[PDB]
Structure 1
C-alpha cells in the first residue's frame, strides 16, 4: 500500500486534484479521505509513458545497438516511460517461435519496466501465415511490422504486405509499416556514391520526402483493399500526413505515429563539418523545418495519434564511425527514448501547441488502446496498473549527454533548454526511480500479453 496525496492528476480526459491510492500492483481508489505516504503537492501525477517503438539489443550493421534491455528500460524510466513495445526481428526461412523465443531471452532478467513485442514479417508464404495463428492466441502478440525499405535486409514486397494485411484482418492484428520505397532509395543511394558524395548529409538527400509519401499512400491503399487496419510508424513529413489525413476522411482505420526528433530537429543540423552529421543518421531522415508545424498540427487535430522514440542507438565513436568513408554503412539510428516524454511536454504543452490532456493521450493512452494494453496501461483509474509518474513542470533544465542515462556517448538534443523533469516513477506500484535515483532491480520487468485490435 502506497499513497500519493497532494497531486494534480492528469489523464487523456481529466484534470483534477485528489489522492490516488495504490494497493499491491493496482490503483484501487481515488478521491478525498497504514500505507506508504508519498507527497506530490505541486507536481503533476500522470500515467506512465508508453513507447511503442523500440529496438533494444538489435543487430544492424555487423554491430548491435548500444543499449540492451536493461540500460534501455532504465533510461525509459528515468525519462518518464513505464512500458515499451520492442520489435522482434524475423529472418527469412524462420521458425517464427524461435525468433520470439530469442526476443524474450533478450529481456528476461534485464528489463526493469514492462515490455511487449511487435513481430516483424519478412515473407508471408504459407508456413508463416500458419504460425501467425499460434502467435496471436498463444504468444500475446497482435501487431506486425513490415518494412517497405532497407532493400536486401528487411524489405518486403507488395505481396507480402497485402497477404499480411488480409491475415491481420482475419486474426485481429495491427499491421505497421515503415513506409519508404526501398527500390528508389537504393538507386539514389548507389548513385550518390557513383558521384563520390559520401558525407552523412547525403543520407538525407538520398531519400526525399516524395518517397515516404509514396509508400505511405501505397500501404494505405492495400489496407483499403484488404479491409484491414494500418499504423504508419514515424511519419516525418507533410507528404505522408497528407496521405494519412486523406484516408481517415474516408473513414478507413489508418493510424499514425511520430517521434520527437521530427518535431524538434531539422536537416540543417546535418550539414556540420566533422562527421557531426552522423549523429543524425536514421530513417526516415530529418526534414526541412516547415514540416515540424504540419506534424504538430496533425497531433493537435487528431490526425496522428501516438508518439514513440524509434530508439535505436549507436556510439558516435567506433559505431557511427563505421562509415566515415560512406553513409551506406552508418548504422541508422538515434538515442531517443529518454527525452521523448519531456520534449513532448516542453515543446508542445508549454508553448501552446497541445493541451495538457492531449500530451498524455499522445505519449501514453492512445498507444495502449491501439496495441491492446488498455486499461492495464496508459491511464490512472481504478483497476489500472500503478504505472504512475510524478512530474515537476516548473524545473528548467538543459538536456545533455553529461546528465542523460542512456548508455551512449551523445545526445541529439544536446544543449536544448527544456521545462519539466521526472521526479519519481512507479511500475505496478514499486519504485523504479525515486527522487531521481535508480532504486529498481533488473528482471522486475514483466512481459505484457496484448489483446487483439479494437478502435479507440
Structure 2
C-alpha cells in the first residue's frame, strides 16, 4: 500500500486534485479522505500526477549493420523510466525462412532479467508466404502479439513487396491486428543512394537529400490505399513531413481506420542541423531523415486536431565514436538511428503544452493513453483509474533544465537535443506500484519488468 497525496492528477480527459491510493500493483481508490490504514506516504503537493509514458516504438538491443544498438533491455528501459516512460513496445525482427516462434523466443530472452519496466513486442513481417500466414494465428492468440511492422524501405535488408503488404493487411483484418508500416519507397531511395555515391557525395548530409519527402508521401499513400482495399487498419509510424500527414488526413476524412505517429525529433529538429563541418551530421542519421522546419508546424497541428494520435521514440541508438564512425567514407554505412527514448516525454511537455500547441490533457493522450488503446493494453496501461496498473509518474513542471549527455541516462556518448533549455522534470516513477525512480534515483531492479500480452484491435 502506497498513498500519493497532494497531487493534481492529469489524464487524457480529467484534471483534478485528489489523492490516489495504490494497493498491491493497482490503483484502488481515488479521492478526498480515503482509508489509508498504515501505508507508505509519498508527497506530491505542487506536482502533476500522470500515467506512465508508453513508447510504442523502440528497437532495444537490435542489430543494424554488423553492429548492435548501444542500449540493451536494461540500460534502455531504465533511461525510459528516468525520462517518464513506464511501458515500451519493441520490434521483434523476423528473418526470411524464419520460425516466427523462434524469432519471438529470441526477443523474450533479450529482455528477461534485464528489463526494469513493462514491455511488449511488435512482430516484423518479412514475407507473407503460406508458412507465415499460418503461424500468425498461434502468435496472436498464444504469444500476446497483435501488431505487425512491414518495412517498405531498407532494400535487401527488411523491405517487403506490395504482395506481402496486402496479404498481411487482409490477414490482419481477419485476425484483429494493427498493421504498421515504415512508409518510404525503398526502390527510389536505393537509386538516389547509389547515384549520390556515383558522384562522390558521401557526407552524412546526403542521407537526407537521398530520401526526399515525396517518397514518404508516396509510400504512406500507397499503404493507405491497400488498407482501404483490404478493409483492414493501419498505423503509419514516424510521420516526418507534410506530404504524409496530408495522405493520412485524407483517408481519415473518408472514415477509414488509419493511424499516425510522430517522434520528438521531427517536432523539435530540422535539416539545417546536419549541414555541419566535421562528421557532426552523423548524429542525426536516421530514417525518415530530418526535414525542413516548415513541417514541424504541420505535424504539431495534426497532433492537436487529432489527425496524428501517438508519439514514440524510435529509439535506436549508436555511439558517435566507433559505431556512427563505421561510415566516415559513406553515409550508407552509418547505422541509422537516434537516442530518443528519455527526453521524449518532456519535450512533448515543454515544447508542446508549455508553448500552447496542445492542452495538458492532450499531452497525456498523445504520449500515453491513445497508444494503449491502439495496441490493446487498455486499461491495464495508459490511465490513472481504479483497476489500472500503478504506472504513475510524479512530474514537476516548474523546473527549468538543459538537456545534455553530461546529465542523461542512456548508454550513448551524445544527445541530439544537447543544449535545449526545457521545462519539466521527472521526480518519481512507479511501475505496478513499485519505485523504479525515487527523487531522481535508480532504486529499481533489473528483471522486474513483465511482458504485456496485448489484446486484438478495437477503435478508440
Question: Does the pair score TM above 0.5?
Answer: yes
1:454 is displaced (CA, Å) by: 0.1
Q: How far apart are residue 315 of structure 1 and its match?
A: 0.1
Using the TM superposition, give the Cα deviation of residue 101 of structure 1 relative to its aligned residue in structure 2, in angstroms: 0.1
Query: How far has the Cα of 1:301 moved from its partner?
Result: 0.1
Write the deviation string for residues 95-152 of structure 1: whole angstroms up to 9, x where unpaired: 0000000000000000000000000000000000000000000000000000000000
What's the offset of the Cα at 1:53? 0.1
Give the distance between the partners of 1:275 and 1:198, measured in 2 at CA. 11
Report the CA distance between 1:403 and its aligned residue: 0.2
Q: Which residue of 2 aligns with 1:212?
A: 216
Deviations 1:140-170 (A, max 9, x none): 0000000000000000000000000000000
Q: Deviations over 1:347-375 (max 9, x none)?
A: 00000000000000000000000000000
Structure 1: distance between partners of 2:158 and 2:58: 16
Which structure 2 residue ranges, 5 or more long, are not aligned?
none
Distance 1:51 1:202 in 2: 29
Cα distance in 1, alignment partners of residues 265 and 348 from structure 2:
10
Q: CA deviation at 1:32?
A: 0.4
| CA-to-aligned-CA distance 1:23-66 (integer Å, 9 cap, x gap) | 00000000000000000001000000000000000000010000
CA distance in 2, matches of 1:200, 1:398: 27
Quick one: distance in 1 between partners of 2:412 and 2:106?
A: 24
Structure 1 position 269, deviation (Å):
0.0
Q: Structure 1: how far apart are the matches of 2:315 and 2:362?
A: 22
CA distance in 1 between partners of 2:57 and 2:277 (Å): 31
Deviation at 1:4, TM superposition (A): 0.1
Cα deviations by residue, 1:190-246 (Å, 9 ceiling, x for unpaired): 000000000000000000000000000000000000000000000000000000000
1:378-436 deviations in Å (ceiling 9; x for gaps): 00000000000000000000000000000000000000000000000000000000000
Q: What secondary structure is seen at the aligned counterpart in 1 of 2:261?
A: strand
Note the C-alpha offset of 1:294. 0.1
Partner Cα separation in structure 1 for residue 232 and residue 153 of structure 2: 21
Runs of 4+ in 1 over 6 A off after TM superposition: none
Matches within 5 A, 1:130-279: 130-279=134-283
Q: Does 1:9 align with 2:13?
A: no
Question: How far did residue 446 of structure 1 move?
Answer: 0.1
The Cα offsets for residues 260-316 of structure 1, whole Å up to 9 and x where unpaired, read as: 000000000000011100000000000000000000000000000000000000000
Q: How many angstroms does 1:174 deviate by?
A: 0.1
Partners of 1:259 and 1:145 lie apart in 2 by: 17
For residue 442 of structure 2, give the secondary structure of its aligned residue in structure 1. coil
Which secondary structure state, in structure 1, belongs to the residue aligned with residue 325 of structure 2? helix
SS in 1 for 2:149: strand
SS in 2 for 1:131: helix
Question: How many angstroms apart in 2 are the aligned matches of 1:286 and 1:245?
Answer: 21
Whole-Å Cα distance in 2 between the matches of residues 320 and 453 of structure 1?
38
SS in 2 for 1:46: strand
Specify the SS of the correspondent of 1:246: helix
Q: Distance in 1 between matches of 2:272 and 2:309?
A: 27
Offset, 1:70: 0.1
Q: Shift of the alpha carbon at 1:73?
A: 0.1
Q: Distance in 1 between matches of 2:3 and 2:83?
A: 22
- Partners of 1:7 and 1:357 lie apart in 2 by 15
Within 2, Cα distance between the matches of 1:79 and 1:95?
36
Q: In structure 2, what is the Cα distance between the partners aligned to 1:16 and 1:86?
A: 33
Q: What is the rounded CA distance, in whole Å, between the counterparts of 2:190 and 2:158 in structure 1?
A: 13
Q: What is the total number of aligned residue pairs between the two structures?
A: 456
Paired with 2:32 and 2:273, the residues of 1 have a C-alpha distance of: 50
TM-score by length of structure 1 reads 1.00
Question: What is the rounded CA distance, in whole Å, between the counterparts of 1:16 and 1:61 in structure 2?
Answer: 49
